[PDB]
Design an enzyme around this catalytic site. Sequence first.
Site, PDB file in Angstrom:
ATOM      1  N   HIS A   1       0.811  -1.212   0.000  1.00 38.87           N
ATOM      2  CA  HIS A   1       0.000   0.000   0.000  1.00 38.87           C
ATOM      3  C   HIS A   1       0.846   1.265   0.000  1.00 38.87           C
ATOM      4  O   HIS A   1       0.305   2.346  -0.246  1.00 38.87           O
ATOM      5  CB  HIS A   1      -0.985  -0.011   1.179  1.00 38.87           C
ATOM      6  CG  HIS A   1      -0.400   0.370   2.507  1.00 38.87           C
ATOM      7  ND1 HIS A   1       0.002  -0.566   3.438  1.00 38.87           N
ATOM      8  CD2 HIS A   1      -0.231   1.578   3.097  1.00 38.87           C
ATOM      9  CE1 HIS A   1       0.429   0.049   4.525  1.00 38.87           C
ATOM     10  NE2 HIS A   1       0.299   1.353   4.345  1.00 38.87           N
TER      11      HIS A   1
ATOM     12  N   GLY B   1       3.024   6.742   8.637  1.00 40.38           N
ATOM     13  CA  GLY B   1       4.305   6.837   7.972  1.00 40.38           C
ATOM     14  C   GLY B   1       5.334   5.821   8.412  1.00 40.38           C
ATOM     15  O   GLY B   1       6.483   5.886   7.954  1.00 40.38           O
TER      16      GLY B   1
ATOM     17  N   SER C   1       4.614   2.300   8.367  1.00 41.55           N
ATOM     18  CA  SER C   1       4.457   1.018   7.694  1.00 41.55           C
ATOM     19  C   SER C   1       5.752   0.670   6.976  1.00 41.55           C
ATOM     20  O   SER C   1       6.462   1.547   6.474  1.00 41.55           O
ATOM     21  CB  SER C   1       3.285   1.049   6.707  1.00 41.55           C
ATOM     22  OG  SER C   1       3.544   1.881   5.596  1.00 41.55           O
TER      23      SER C   1
ATOM     24  N   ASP D   1       0.040  -7.557   1.664  1.00 39.99           N
ATOM     25  CA  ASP D   1       0.440  -6.150   1.683  1.00 39.99           C
ATOM     26  C   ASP D   1       1.959  -6.015   1.711  1.00 39.99           C
ATOM     27  O   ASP D   1       2.506  -5.171   2.425  1.00 39.99           O
ATOM     28  CB  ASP D   1      -0.185  -5.405   2.865  1.00 39.99           C
ATOM     29  CG  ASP D   1      -0.096  -3.895   2.715  1.00 39.99           C
ATOM     30  OD1 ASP D   1       0.164  -3.418   1.582  1.00 39.99           O
ATOM     31  OD2 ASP D   1      -0.280  -3.180   3.731  1.00 39.99           O
TER      32      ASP D   1
HETATM   33  C1  LIG Z   1      -3.630  -1.046  -2.331  1.00 42.01           C
HETATM   34  O1  LIG Z   1      -3.301  -2.408  -2.158  1.00 42.01           O
HETATM   35  C2  LIG Z   1      -3.381  -2.855  -0.829  1.00 42.01           C
HETATM   36  C3  LIG Z   1      -3.143  -4.339  -0.505  1.00 42.01           C
HETATM   37  C4  LIG Z   1      -3.232  -4.838   0.941  1.00 42.01           C
HETATM   38  C5  LIG Z   1      -3.569  -3.824   2.072  1.00 42.01           C
HETATM   39  N1  LIG Z   1      -3.652  -4.306   3.468  1.00 42.01           N
HETATM   40  C6  LIG Z   1      -3.967  -3.353   4.525  1.00 42.01           C
HETATM   41  C7  LIG Z   1      -4.057  -3.836   5.980  1.00 42.01           C
HETATM   42  C8  LIG Z   1      -4.202  -1.862   4.180  1.00 42.01           C
HETATM   43  O2  LIG Z   1      -4.502  -0.944   5.232  1.00 42.01           O
HETATM   44  C9  LIG Z   1      -4.460   0.359   4.847  1.00 42.01           C
HETATM   45  C10 LIG Z   1      -3.047   0.987   4.933  1.00 42.01           C
HETATM   46  C11 LIG Z   1      -2.779   0.785   6.164  1.00 42.01           C
HETATM   47  C12 LIG Z   1      -1.925   1.813   6.971  1.00 42.01           C
HETATM   48  O3  LIG Z   1      -2.275   2.948   7.102  1.00 42.01           O
HETATM   49  N2  LIG Z   1      -0.683   1.336   7.612  1.00 42.01           N
HETATM   50  C13 LIG Z   1       0.043   2.275   8.477  1.00 42.01           C
HETATM   51  C14 LIG Z   1       0.892   3.379   7.806  1.00 42.01           C
HETATM   52  O4  LIG Z   1       1.700   4.019   8.402  1.00 42.01           O
HETATM   53  N3  LIG Z   1       0.703   3.619   6.388  1.00 42.01           N
HETATM   54  S1  LIG Z   1       1.670   4.865   5.725  1.00 42.01           S
HETATM   55  O5  LIG Z   1       3.111   4.641   5.890  1.00 42.01           O
HETATM   56  O6  LIG Z   1       1.383   6.129   6.411  1.00 42.01           O
HETATM   57  C15 LIG Z   1       1.148   4.961   3.973  1.00 42.01           C
HETATM   58  C16 LIG Z   1      -0.350   5.097   3.626  1.00 42.01           C
HETATM   59  C17 LIG Z   1       1.994   4.098   3.036  1.00 42.01           C
HETATM   60  C18 LIG Z   1       2.144   5.626   3.025  1.00 42.01           C
HETATM   61  C19 LIG Z   1       0.777   1.904   9.782  1.00 42.01           C
HETATM   62  C20 LIG Z   1      -0.477   2.744   9.826  1.00 42.01           C
HETATM   63  C21 LIG Z   1      -0.291   3.959  10.788  1.00 42.01           C
HETATM   64  C22 LIG Z   1      -1.379   4.660  11.208  1.00 42.01           C
HETATM   65  C23 LIG Z   1      -2.820   4.270  10.781  1.00 42.01           C
HETATM   66  C24 LIG Z   1      -3.563   5.457  10.108  1.00 42.01           C
HETATM   67  C25 LIG Z   1      -5.082   5.103   9.959  1.00 42.01           C
HETATM   68  C26 LIG Z   1      -5.269   3.889   8.989  1.00 42.01           C
HETATM   69  C27 LIG Z   1      -5.793   2.667   9.814  1.00 42.01           C
HETATM   70  C28 LIG Z   1      -5.794   1.373   8.982  1.00 42.01           C
HETATM   71  N4  LIG Z   1      -6.163   0.301   9.873  1.00 42.01           N
HETATM   72  C29 LIG Z   1      -6.605  -0.989   9.344  1.00 42.01           C
HETATM   73  O7  LIG Z   1      -6.803  -1.148   8.181  1.00 42.01           O
HETATM   74  O8  LIG Z   1      -6.771  -2.017  10.315  1.00 42.01           O
HETATM   75  C30 LIG Z   1      -7.422  -3.229   9.934  1.00 42.01           C
HETATM   76  C31 LIG Z   1      -8.868  -2.970   9.564  1.00 42.01           C
HETATM   77  C32 LIG Z   1      -6.749  -3.903   8.951  1.00 42.01           C
HETATM   78  C33 LIG Z   1      -5.669  -4.842   9.725  1.00 42.01           C
HETATM   79  C34 LIG Z   1      -6.062  -4.720  11.291  1.00 42.01           C
HETATM   80  C35 LIG Z   1      -7.345  -4.240  11.295  1.00 42.01           C
HETATM   81  C36 LIG Z   1      -4.399   1.114   8.419  1.00 42.01           C
HETATM   82  O9  LIG Z   1      -3.462   1.013   9.148  1.00 42.01           O
HETATM   83  N5  LIG Z   1      -4.225   1.001   6.934  1.00 42.01           N
HETATM   84  C37 LIG Z   1      -5.153   1.117   6.002  1.00 42.01           C
HETATM   85  N6  LIG Z   1      -4.115  -1.388   2.806  1.00 42.01           N
HETATM   86  C38 LIG Z   1      -3.802  -2.365   1.747  1.00 42.01           C
HETATM   87  C39 LIG Z   1      -3.715  -1.854   0.288  1.00 42.01           C
END
Ligand SMILES: COc1ccc2nc(C)c(O[C@@H]3C[C@H]4C(=O)N[C@]5(C(=O)NS(=O)(=O)C6(C)CC6)C[C@H]5/C=C\CCCCC[C@H](NC(=O)OC5(C)CCCC5)C(=O)N4C3)nc2c1
EC number: 3.4.22.-
Length: 198
Positions: free
Chosen positions: A76, A156, A158, A100
């Site tokens: 993602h 930020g 992940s 992911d």
């Molecule tokens: C497009 O193809 C795909 C394929 C697989 C996939 N699998 C996924 C699991 C998936 O989730 C999505 C991305 C991910 C994400 O934000 N992660 C990071 C992050 O930092 N991101 S980032 O670096 O800022 C960025 C955005 C890259 C630049 C750590 C979190 C920090 C703070 C959270 C902010 C609020 C979002 C809460 C969401 N909670 C959540 O979904 O919890 C569930 C329901 C699922 C699991 C436990 C219960 C969440 O965390 N989300 C949504 N998207 C995908 C997309």
Amino acid sequence: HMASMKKKGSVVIVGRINLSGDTAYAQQTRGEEGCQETSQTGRDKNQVEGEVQIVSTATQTFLATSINGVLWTVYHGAGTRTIASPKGPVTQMYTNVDKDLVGWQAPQGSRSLTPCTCGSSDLYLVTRHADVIPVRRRGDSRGSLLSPRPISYLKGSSGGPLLCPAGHAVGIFRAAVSTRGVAKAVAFIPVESLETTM
Ligand SMILES: COc1ccc2nc(C)c(O[C@@H]3C[C@H]4C(=O)N[C@]5(C(=O)NS(=O)(=O)C6(C)CC6)C[C@H]5/C=C\CCCCC[C@H](NC(=O)OC5(C)CCCC5)C(=O)N4C3)nc2c1
Ligand SMILES: [Zn+2]
């Protein structure tokens, strides 16, 4: 039209989380403008060090972690993008949207974490701000924060590592479990899922 179709840029290393000494701290190695130009060309001549890289695209920034000679991050964040390297863009070696997860060959000069074999449940999450957050493992892909905090503090991060007490890689940070904006738990890609993909 075909003549105008553009290409997405490469993922670019823009810094690292320094875990060398007794104090963890983020270092930036490239500014926004150099990042944009490096994303376009895919040619990154900057020296690369350490285990946890800060990476950026044109629109997102997150982390990437070297384990067993592979630089791993989240789909993602990176999609199917190449990563910039001294010799030009490098195509992904692993891509798994279902987990992911993506990975590239680890850049020269990086250091790799060792996959954890300890079976310990006392973990540590490393964020893009170089916070080391204690996390209790709660399942194959879940852990609870000992001290919850707003999701803003995890955004930020992940692609960052969860580590065991001995500093082995236990998983790759994937998602935050939030209640009214407060992160109480995290989801991660277990290193065994990485080792199977490999
Ligand atoms: C497009 O193809 C795909 C394929 C697989 C996939 N699998 C996924 C699991 C998936 O989730 C999505 C991305 C991910 C994400 O934000 N992660 C990071 C992050 O930092 N991101 S980032 O670096 O800022 C960025 C955005 C890259 C630049 C750590 C979190 C920090 C703070 C959270 C902010 C609020 C979002 C809460 C969401 N909670 C959540 O979904 O919890 C569930 C329901 C699922 C699991 C436990 C219960 C969440 O965390 N989300 C949504 N998207 C995908 C997309
Ligand atoms: Zn271990």
